[PDB]
């Protein structure tokens, strides 16, 4: 499928819910069909005046238009996701979902985002993602929880929307989801004082920081096989229980520090020099990403700087579990 | 995917 | 306290929040300040525009001068709320709060609805309650929430503005909270699957008021049989927590009446509903379309009497033959206060 | 009055 | 080791 046939059917389609999500909508113990259409006209409001910022004055109806093909995207992929909602649990019980103010915003913008990536391929200005987070005072975390059922729900996506929208996961995953900001936190404490949207998330970041893991480590070190499962190990405990590491940083760097720490207990010489020149071969590596990290308030530092200070202050006693009598317990190779 | 219910803890 | 007290209060108040406020954000496990501050901006185009629809196109910068006043007012209002919170319980634990955007618009709401209330009284299009309710999409039951602890939060609001947001109040108790659209019945639903500290305070507030409307109708209409009050508030308390379905799209007064003249119709005591219906209209705030026009069946409307006969009795004529039945229910306690 | 942990559940 | 710091950078 091609870009003109997706946006073909999208001038085609209404801007209003069609007779079928209405009937999802009057099934509700609390109708939203008012808060949905409300929502979507007052988000219009937002979305032009802040596209039109961002493009320039004469473009507002240019970015209305523009508005009104991601509505009705929204519009189709909520109906395909309710169907297939229905489908699998063989009843409607649409009322939390359908009035979660959250979902709705997160619905809208991945929409949305299909719409300004396809655009910003093309012409001057980059609309793409994470652009439409800041548009509409949207988290993360919770643009996150729609992309996959996302793309199941809209069949004529292109190959390459489809690629982009997983880049955006990625990114969610590795970084955004892991910001101050992000209700991720509140989640976790929830938990370490339960849910199963935590779990769905641990387990596609297990997977992603697994997979840049291995390939680090048949680079680096092929000579050491036994190497990449106990330095998997801390990486798992890390993310699981030290999870503030985690703030306002990024996925990778914990992953290096992992490697380098537990090479460092294991006799074996790999300095982050070595790391740090395999790591910006990785598929969508920047160097930002181990020149620029978080040590204490707003300082910033390279990687060597938040190892020595911050991942070595916090995990010191835990590395050196490793290569004492009792080292602790493997943890699972995440499958797939 | 998950099913909706799932990803919104429902 | 004086209309002049409180704006210049305003007028001379910080569009941002506070060193305390911002202390507070920082303090929260997910931190709220960015989420805060754009909404403030994000909502003001929102209001400016609807304000500018409403009173018209040459007033926007008029309508963005009152935002400002309402967004000072939430800022005020805000940490006044997060102090006593911190004090009554001796910790900061506010980062669900504070990241919660429907306590923030509700907060932002009842704020600007102060505002509105006041330039609404003096010139004019009216855009006191429940207009700020459709411009931000927020749903009567929430605003509730924070009705009672924004007045205490603000000793600045003369005695004007605190009976106003007291009738905002009991509005959304008697009807407003109980619309189709509204939260309350995903509140019930998950309490009856299954437990809500909110919903257990919002139905105390609703026995109240209930309880001493019911109780006025009785002294004038019962007075001869006051055995009858404490009966027919079991039955409409029985009714509303039960049954609450009779409530939706419908009015507290409503099933108030019925339980009146469904008590008396099995205790064998005349009552007509002419009657019933002739003191509710001497009620302070009563209105003569609650019993002439009541929702029947889909979107037919009917009077009460018709429907007491379709829907309520339909719904409730079992549990009202046991009141005279040999061994009646357990009364229900009289509301505290 | 009640606290706003009361009214929003928590 | 006798040190887990990295002495380079």
Same mark, same amino acid.
């Given at each position: ?37 409300? +929502?979507? /006209? ?33 519009? &189709? ?7 297939? =909602?229905?489908?699998? *649990? ?30 910003? +391929? ?34 004529? $996506? ?45 387990? /596609? ?6 997979? +840049? ?9 092929? =000579?050491?096989?036994?190497? =990449? ?32 720490? !537990? ?10 020099? !070595? ?6 071969? $990785? ?8 020149? &620029?990290?978080? !040590? ?17 202050? +916090? *995990? ?21 | ?10």
């Amino acid at each position: 499928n091609t870009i003109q046939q997706l946006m073909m059917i999208l001038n085609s389609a209404s801007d209003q819910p069609s007779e079928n999500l209405i009937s999802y909508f009057n099934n509700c113990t609390v109708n939203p069909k008012e808060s949905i259409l409300k +929502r979507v /006209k007052d988000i219009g409001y937002i979305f032009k005046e802040k596209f039109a910022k961002a493009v320039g004055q004469g473009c507002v109806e240019i970015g209305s238009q523009r508005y009104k093909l991601g509505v009705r995207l929204y519009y &189709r992929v909520m109906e395909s996701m309710l169907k297939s =909602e229905e489908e699998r *649990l063989s009843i409607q019980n649409f009322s939390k979902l359908l009035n979660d103010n959250i979902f709705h915003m997160s619905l809208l913008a991945c929409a949305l985002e299909v719409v300004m990536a396809t655009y910003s +391929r093309s012409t001057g200005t980059d609309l793409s993602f994470p652009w439409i987070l800041n548009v509409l005072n949207l988290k993360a975390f919770d643009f996150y929880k729609v992309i996959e059922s996302f793309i199941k729900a809209e069949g004529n $996506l292109t190959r390459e929307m489809i690629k982009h929208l997983e880049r955006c996961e990625h990114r969610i995953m590795e970084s955004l989801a892991w910001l101050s900001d992000s209700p991720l936190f509140d989640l976790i404490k929830q938990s370490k004082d339960k849910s199963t949207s935590l779990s769905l998330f641990y387990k /596609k970041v297990y997977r992603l920081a697994y997979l +840049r893991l291995n390939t680090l480590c048949e680079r680096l070190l092929s =000579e050491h096989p036994e190497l =990449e499962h106990i330095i998997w190990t801390l990486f798992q405990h890390t993310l699981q229980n030290e999870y503030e590491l985690m703030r306002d940083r990024h996925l990778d760097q914990i992953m290096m520090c992992s490697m380098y720490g !537990i090479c460092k207990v294991k006799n074996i010489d790999l300095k982050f020099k !070595i790391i740090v020149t395999a790591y910006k071969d $990785l598929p969508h590596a920047v160097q930002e990403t181990f020149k &620029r990290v978080l !040590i204490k308030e707003e300082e910033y530092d390279s990687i060597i700087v938040f190892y020595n200070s911050v991942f070595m202050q +916090r *995990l010191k006693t835990n590395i050196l579990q490793y290569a004492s009598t009792r080292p602790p317990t493997l943890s699972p190779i995440p499958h797939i | 995917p998950p099913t909706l219910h799932e990803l919104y803890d429902l």
